[PDB]
């Protein structure tokens, strides 16, 4: 009964149809706990990512003589929403699916074949959650991996697009995600090639290309913001040290 998209072209929080939320990121936030780390703020989302490795494997069974092993762990706290969660999310099938998807995404991008007989561990903590969490996870992983000095081919950027009747809305929040179907994308560099495509609710077949194009443009802008932040941090680091 609310005005999701007003006749004047405004959304509930005051944004327009093709505008991103506030995007803030930090690099090298936990120097004593990991080789690489980042802190991501996208709207009201708050995520901490730590990268440990490359290092000696814990067990002799998890050793590969041709490349490194990559592991991803995701922790969603009980206080990340308005209503407190009853039980833990550690062993849910949804979380395991998310972890497998992230590992398979980043296997093809990291040059794992130049670190044989090593392991790289990624630990993620989600403190606050307000819609579009998968894209934020992708962006945080990319930033933390680059901060650790690990070789890769390009950036990967995450984005979410919702479809409201006939109107595409970019970078939806919790209110919009509970009232329409959404699409999540993972884009490589500045190209049109997708690493991830995730649709979980019904969408008409003849309305998907437009959503894909809007999401691709949004992800290009996200990549620009991440690159600018990384260059600024590197300039500050090298200027004095």
């Amino acid at each position: 009964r609310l005005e999701i998209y007003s006749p004047e072209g405004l959304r509930l929080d005051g944004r327009r149809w093709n505008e991103l939320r506030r995007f803030e990121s930090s690099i090298n936030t936990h120097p004593h706990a990991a080789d690489g780390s980042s802190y991501m703020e996208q709207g009201n989302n708050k995520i901490i990512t730590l990268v440990k490795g490359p290092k000696e494997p814990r067990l002799k069974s998890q050793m590969d003589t041709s490349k490194a092993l990559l592991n991803v762990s995701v922790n969603i706290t009980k206080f990340s929403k308005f209503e407190r969660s009853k039980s833990s999310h550690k062993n849910e099938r949804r979380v395991l699916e998310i972890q497998t998807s992230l590992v398979r995404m980043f296997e093809k991008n990291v040059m794992l074949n130049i670190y044989p007989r090593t392991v790289i561990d990624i630990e993620i903590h989600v403190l606050e959650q307000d819609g579009g969490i998968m894209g934020s996870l992708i962006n945080g992983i990319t930033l933390a991996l680059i901060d650790a000095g690990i070789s890769m081919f390009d950036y990967i950027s995450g984005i979410s697009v919702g479809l409201y009747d006939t109107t595409p809305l970019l970078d939806t929040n919790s209110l919009e995600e509970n009232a329409m179907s959404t699409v999540t994308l993972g884009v490589v560099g500045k190209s049109e090639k997708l690493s991830l495509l995730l649709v979980e609710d019904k969408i008409p077949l003849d309305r998907l290309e437009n959503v894909l194009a809007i999401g691709i443009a949004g992800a290009h802008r996200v990549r620009d913001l991440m690159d600018e932040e990384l260059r600024k941090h590197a300039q500050k680091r090298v200027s004095n040290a």
Binding site: E8, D13, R15, R16, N18, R21, N44, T167
Partner: protein, 915 residues
């Protein structure tokens, strides 16, 4: 604390607490502030340089006039900014076409109105949407603008913050529009900026005397909302509708789920200020007050009432403590010619009597009551204070003089029928070609196939002689027939139905308007259409000699009319001739015409005869109920008659409906639009059966459809054949009501329709005047692979809402038509005073019910005036006979049922009476 992001875009935080049923939760939101919000004034020259297109790439439009209304000194050329309470209380003034020409609505006002009253918010949004060169309304987003956003100061109520925000918006307009010598006036009835109250602003208008009367004007107190909610949750309080009759205004009944029988409410004070049909909250009364301070005690009392309902002859009582919902719509009423004072030129208080007899009297304030003494008016109800004995209201609009043809409008409002003309947005959806839209000569033309990507499936059936038969007063065409003989000896038939769904698309304003009006309303003189004239009357009606799109169904029915081949398709045809019932009868009976077209017509006639014989074999519920057709045209009450052509197309329409029902049920077994008629109870049947076997000595069997039809056919009288139709119409008022539904609701055994003894039924043949036929057309188009279905017709909830809406509108339209025809009959019988006969259909212990056969309007004659010295009357139920002596000539004369008496009509003062 706000942050500047990229382009003069800032973001803040919004924190509040939500109160659920006992819970407390804090909510955090982000709030963006912009700098591209236009003033939407046509005189501005700097705002058009900051606007951006929307998702559909459309630039904003500027609405407010550059030369607005000019008042006296020292304001001049003003705009108006509204307030929350003014909008909530005075919505009738805003819709008045004589004031409020240029109005600005802030965002916070709209939000508050939506929170407190959704229908008022809907009406305000409609006012904003339908802007033209007479009234102009805009919405300004003051909360999203960085020039007008204010932050709540510590220790300050929300009302103060909202008022400060409104004043800031008024100031921003005051300084923004100054170079164009336009001022802004803030209108609010509460307590630089030109601030005036509603009364003060009205007196400044040049026509204040014409609109000043529309200004909005010891019982125990209601419980608080928290108290009511706590009582409801614990099981102490109960909720339900309230029904009050016009014979007794000091008693009512409320039905509760936990009780088998309604709970009585007795008393002028026990009934709070409540109307008929309200949603109320009740509370049980102690046993010491039943008709002949803690939650545990009240639960025990509820248990006592539950156990005393079954057998104990003591009725539990209750009282009203809270009003949940109020109908309180616009009411049509007339002035009471007893509270008016001739020797008073000042403002006085008068009373208005409502047309609805179940509603109390409403007090009205005015100063021109002399001119409204004999007229019909529209009013609205404002409030009912505890001290006052009657509710208070205000004048809205004047209809016209009493008994005038136009004014007697009133039935449309009372029966809730929409009749205002369509808006510009609806007319935009219509084809731009207008009346120049013509179907292509060749369906495979490159332009034709390019403009219609689905034209590769549309068949070409313009090769047959096609005729249509409709009443002479009919214009919109929905049916067309043709016939031919195959070499093998089989008869080929085909029913052509107009294709409304081609030009009507789901999700458009035209579709929404068509779905709001359930059915078209037909009057003997006027007509109210569900669809616009341009589309239905001209572009979609299958007119002769011109090409028209249509949906086609073909059958191969043998000489015995047995189905062997049935097919449905969308094709292109061209009608040859149009006929009428009597003209077609004279055509077929014209022997000198030996053309093949009349042979096809008579073949259709014989096929329909066979079909109706088969139907009567299945069931013979054939009726003859006159509608009392009236057509005077005084520079003659006749009876409608059934002709052979009337029974010809009926069977074809029935066959098409049955075939479409079967096909759509087979295609979509869960969301198919169907109609049903359940078997009725026997009480209304058994009372008539007892009366008949007492006096007439007949019987009606309730074994089945065929048994009931045979029982009706048994009742025959050699002297008066009209007695047969009398028992047919008498039994016509006993069955249940047919209702629309969706196939996913009930089981297949429940799909049976009793009237025609058909296991499944639907409506398909008249998409112009019925929305259910449009839905069936969409379903059958999606059932053949021609086009996928939409979304609204694949969900149970939306289908249920559509079913409820169409059922309600069908019932309302039937009531409106009956009221109109009865009013016209009464008018034509009042002017001409003569002698008219009648029939007796019901006997009362103190009266007789007399029904006129040539008029159809029943009449009741009270024994108080029928018989002098009423104590000498004698009536018994053994023979349904009353004994009395008439006033004109004293004599013991008995009155029976089905007798003949002479009846005339007199004037109504506040009706039929014995002649």
């Amino acid at each position: 604390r706000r942050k500047r992001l990229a382009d003069g875009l800032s973001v803040t935080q919004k924190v509040f607490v939500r109160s659920r049923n006992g819970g407390a939760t804090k909510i955090v939101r982000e709030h963006y502030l912009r700098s591209d919000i236009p003033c939407l004034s046509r005189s501005c020259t700097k705002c058009p340089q900051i606007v951006v297109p929307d998702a559909q790439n459309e630039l904003p439009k500027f609405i407010l006039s550059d030369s607005p209304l000019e008042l006296s000194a020292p304001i001049g050329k003003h705009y108006v900014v509204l307030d929350t309470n003014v909008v909530l209380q005075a919505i009738d003034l805003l819709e008045n076409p004589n004031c409020f020409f240029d109005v600005i609505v802030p965002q916070i006002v709209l939000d508050e109105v939506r929170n407190k009253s959704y229908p008022v918010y809907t009406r305000l949004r409609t006012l904003c949407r339908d802007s033209d060169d007479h009234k102009r309304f805009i919405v300004f987003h003051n909360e999203f603008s960085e020039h007008t956003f204010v932050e709540r100061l510590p220790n300050e109520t929300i009302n103060d913050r909202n008022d400060r925000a409104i004043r800031k918006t008024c100031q921003w307009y005051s300084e923004h529009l100054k170079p164009y010598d336009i001022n802004v006036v803030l209108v609010t009835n509460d307590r630089n900026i030109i601030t005036k109250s509603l009364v003060q602003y009205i007196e400044l208008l040049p026509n204040a005397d014409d609109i000043r009367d529309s200004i909005p004007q010891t019982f125990p107190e209601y419980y608080s909302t928290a108290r009511v909610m706590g009582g409801l949750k614990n099981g102490v309080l109960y909720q339900g509708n309230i029904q009050i009759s016009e014979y007794n205004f000091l008693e009512g009944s409320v039905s509760l789920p936990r009780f088998s029988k309604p709970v009585l409410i007795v008393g002028q004070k026990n009934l709070n200020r409540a109307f008929n049909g309200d949603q109320v909250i009740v509370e049980l009364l102690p046993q010491s007050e039943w008709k002949a301070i803690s939650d545990k005690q009240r639960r025990l009392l509820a248990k006592d009432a539950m156990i005393a309902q079954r057998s104990k002859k003591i009725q539990p009582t209750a009282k009203v403590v809270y009003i949940q919902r109020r109908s309180w719509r616009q009411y049509v009423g007339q002035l009471a010619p007893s509270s008016v004072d001739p020797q008073s030129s000042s403002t006085q208080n008068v009373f208005v009597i409502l047309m609805d007899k179940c509603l109390p009297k409403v007090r009205i304030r005015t100063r021109r009551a002399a001119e409204l003494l004999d007229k019909r008016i529209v009013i609205s109800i404002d409030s009912w204070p505890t001290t006052h004995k009657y509710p208070l209201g205000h004048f809205v609009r004047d209809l016209g003089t009493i008994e005038s043809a136009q004014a007697e409008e009133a039935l449309l409002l009372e029966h809730d029928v929409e009749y205002r003309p369509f808006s510009k947005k609806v007319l935009e959806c219509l084809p731009a070609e207008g009346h120049d839209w013509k179907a292509p000569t060749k369906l495979d033309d490159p332009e034709a196939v390019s403009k219609d990507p689905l034209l590769t499936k549309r068949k070409d059936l313009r090769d047959k002689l096609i005729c249509s038969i409709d009443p002479p007063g009919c214009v919109d065409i929905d049916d067309a027939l043709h016939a031919k003989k195959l070499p093998n000896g089989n008869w080929e038939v085909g029913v052509h139905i107009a294709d409304v769904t081609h030009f009507v698309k789901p999700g458009t304003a035209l579709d929404a308007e068509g779905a709001a009006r359930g059915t078209s309303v037909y009057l003997v003189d006027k007509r109210i259409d569900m669809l616009p004239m341009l589309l239905g009357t001209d572009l979609c009606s299958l007119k002769p000699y011109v090409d028209r799109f249509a949906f086609s169904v073909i059958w191969e029915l043998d000489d015995s009319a047995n189905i062997v081949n049935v097919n449905f398709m969308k094709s292109v045809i061209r009608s040859r001739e149009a006929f009428s019932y009597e003209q077609a009868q004279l055509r077929i009976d014209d022997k000198t015409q030996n053309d093949e077209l009349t042979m096809g017509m008579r073949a259709l006639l014989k096929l329909s005869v066979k079909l109706k014989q088969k139907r009567l074999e299945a069931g013979a519920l054939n009726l003859a109920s006159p509608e009392v057709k009236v057509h005077m045209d005084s520079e003659e009450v006749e009876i409608k008659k059934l002709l052979a052509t009337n029974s010809l197309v009926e069977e074809f329409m029935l066959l098409a409906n049955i075939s479409v029902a079967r096909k759509i049920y087979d295609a979509f077994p869960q969301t198919a639009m169907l109609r049903r008629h359940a078997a009725p109870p026997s009480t209304n049947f058994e009372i008539l059966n007892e009366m008949l076997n007492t006096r007439k000595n007949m019987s009606i069997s309730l074994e089945s459809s065929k048994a009931l039809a045979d029982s009706l056919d048994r009742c025959v009288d050699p002297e008066d054949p009209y007695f047969n139709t009398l028992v047919r119409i008498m039994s016509t008022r006993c069955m249940m009501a047919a209702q629309y539904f969706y196939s996913g609701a009930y089981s297949y055994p429940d799909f049976r329709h009793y009237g025609l003894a058909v296991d499944i039924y639907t409506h398909f043949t008249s998409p112009i005047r019925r929305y259910c036929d449009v839905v069936a057309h969409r379903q059958l188009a999606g059932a053949i692979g021609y086009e996928p279905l939409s979304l609204t017709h694949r969900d149970k909830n939306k289908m249920d809402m559509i079913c409820r809406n169409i059922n309600r509108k069908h019932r309302n339209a039937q009531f409106a038509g009956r009221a109109s025809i009865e009013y016209y009959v009464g008018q034509v019988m009042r002017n001409n005073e003569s002698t008219e006969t009648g029939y007796v259909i019901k006997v009362f212990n103190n009266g007789i019910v007399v029904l006129v056969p040539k008029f159809g309007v029943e009449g009741l004659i009270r024994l108080d005036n029928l018989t002098e010295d009423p104590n000498s009357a004698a009536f018994d139920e053994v023979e349904y006979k009353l004994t009395f002596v008439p006033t004109n000539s004293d004599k013991p004369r008995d009155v029976y049922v089905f007798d003949k008496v002479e009846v005339q009509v007199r004037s109504v003062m506040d009706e039929l009476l014995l002649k």
